[PDB]
């Protein structure tokens, strides 16, 4: 439904889909682009929080972490830049957009989270 509809189209973007109704908003889908960008296999990304706490590390700004979390808690669309760690442990500045997605009954069923390395173009 709303999940299938979103998967198209990749648009050359890197994204995950988090379940909006479940605590920590677990990822139920990540595309090749996200897996390439993050360095993680699709199987290990599955059920991680779509706020991407699994990629936080020493240099990640904890104030930004809290604002990202608040975006999910309030079902808001916001964008952030956040320093996170690829699987190979290299710290990368990511531009991250979070968009709550609503079904026909206007209930938030998922979060569409899109990612890019800021030094890419």
């Amino acid at each position: 439904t709303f999940l299938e509809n979103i998967v198209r189209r990749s648009n050359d973007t890197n994204f995950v889909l988090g379940n909006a109704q479940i605590v920590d908003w677990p990822i139920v889908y990540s595309n090749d682009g996200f897996c390439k960008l993050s360095g993680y296999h699709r199987a290990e990304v599955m059920q991680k929080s779509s706020a991407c706490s699994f990629m936080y590390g020493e240099l990640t700004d904890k104030d930004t972490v809290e604002k990202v979390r608040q975006t999910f808690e309030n079902y808001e669309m916001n964008s952030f830049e956040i320093l996170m760690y690829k699987k190979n442990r290299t710290p990368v500045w990511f531009f991250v957009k979070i968009a709550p997605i609503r079904n026909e009954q206007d209930k938030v069923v998922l979060f569409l989270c899109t990612f890019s390395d800021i030094t890419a173009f």
Binding site: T1, L3, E4, V7, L17, N19, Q21, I22, V23, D24, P26, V28, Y29, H41, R42, A43, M46, Q47
Partner: protein, 173 residues
């Protein structure tokens, strides 16, 4: 679910020339890295054991509680994995699902429903037939299991809570 029923078809008729049978399996054999170093004898043995399942949108591949006796490869289409009435995964072309313990365990009982979102084609192989092959091709058994990573493990229940149940259980303490 469709598994275990007449909806599961043999990929190869038993009198089909062996090399044509291997060709019929290419969407898995030539794409999934776990099959990389198989001898011809090994590919032929696997090809004759593989089955295919074709599902319509809404069809269930497995219901929670049903026995899981096969490794399942998605070759076309998309499916949702549902546990406790929530989507916990979306599977697509290239994904593999089944029992994480497929190698040593006879059976797993599924903890989730697996439901087609679109028309879907799966290539599936029973783990007892797979194990017979791997017990013969000993070197292949090492490289196969090394590179066979499940996108979803139907044996394990995911521990999660719904945001609304936490909210109520907050309000009531």
């Amino acid at each position: 679910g469709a598994m275990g029923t007449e909806k599961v078809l043999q990929i190869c008729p038993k009198d089909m020339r062996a090399d044509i049978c291997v060709h019929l399996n290419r969407k898995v054999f030539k794409e999934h890295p776990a099959f990389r170093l198989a001898s011809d004898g090994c590919l032929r043995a696997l090809a004759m054991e593989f089955q295919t399942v074709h599902c319509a949108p809404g069809d269930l591949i497995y219901h929670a509680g049903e026995s899981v006796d096969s490794l399942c490869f998605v070759v076309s289409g998309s499916l949702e994995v549902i546990q406790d009435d929530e989507v916990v995964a979306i599977l697509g072309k290239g994904d593999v699902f089944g029992d994480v313990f497929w190698k040593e365990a006879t059976l797993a009982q599924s903890c989730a429903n697996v439901r087609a979102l679109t028309y879907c084609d799966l290539h599936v192989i029973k783990r007892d037939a797979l194990q017979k092959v791997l017990e013969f091709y000993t070197a292949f058994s090492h490289s196969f299991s090394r590179n066979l990573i499940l996108t979803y493990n139907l044996r394990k229940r995911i521990v999660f809570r719904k945001i609304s149940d936490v909210k109520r259980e907050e309000e009531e303490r």
